[PDB]
C-alpha cells in the first residue's frame, strides 16, 4: 500500500520531519480494533518518536 | 479647438491579480 501511492505537486520537504533526519511519507488511519491488532502483531516495526 | 489626447493611452494592470498571485503563492511552499 505504501509504495502504490504517487507524489504531489506542492510537497513541502521541511514539514513533518521526525527526529534522526527521517521523513514521513504519508499517514494511515484505521479504527481502534484494527490498530490494536496491527500493534499487537507488528511490534517489531513500530517505534515511538 | 477640440482637445484630443496627446499620445495613445498606456495600459494599466489591475491590482486584483496581486491578490490572485498572493493567494496562489499561499498554495505553494513559502513566499519567503
Amino acid at each position: 500500500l505504501a509504495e502504490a501511492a504517487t507524489d504531489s505537486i506542492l510537497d513541502n520537504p521541511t514539514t513533518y520531519t521526525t527526529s534522526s533526519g527521517a521523513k514521513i511519507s504519508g499517514v494511515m488511519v484505521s479504527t481502534a480494533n484494527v490498530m490494536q491488532i496491527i500493534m499487537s502483531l507488528l511490534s517489531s516495526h513500530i517505534t515511538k518518536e | 479647438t477640440v482637445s484630443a489626447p496627446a499620445t495613445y493611452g498606456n495600459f494599466v494592470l489591475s491590482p486584483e491579480n496581486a491578490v490572485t498571485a498572493i493567494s496562489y503563492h499561499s498554495i505553494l511552499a513559502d513566499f519567503n
Binding site: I9, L10 | N17, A21, I22, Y24, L28, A29, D30, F31
Partner: peptide, 16 residues
C-alpha cells in the same frame, strides 16, 4: 513584481 506575480521559488513550479 518579480516576487509577486512570478513567485518565490523558480524551481519545481512557476506562475504562468
Amino acid at each position: 513584481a518579480l516576487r509577486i506575480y512570478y513567485g518565490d521559488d523558480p524551481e519545481r513550479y512557476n506562475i504562468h
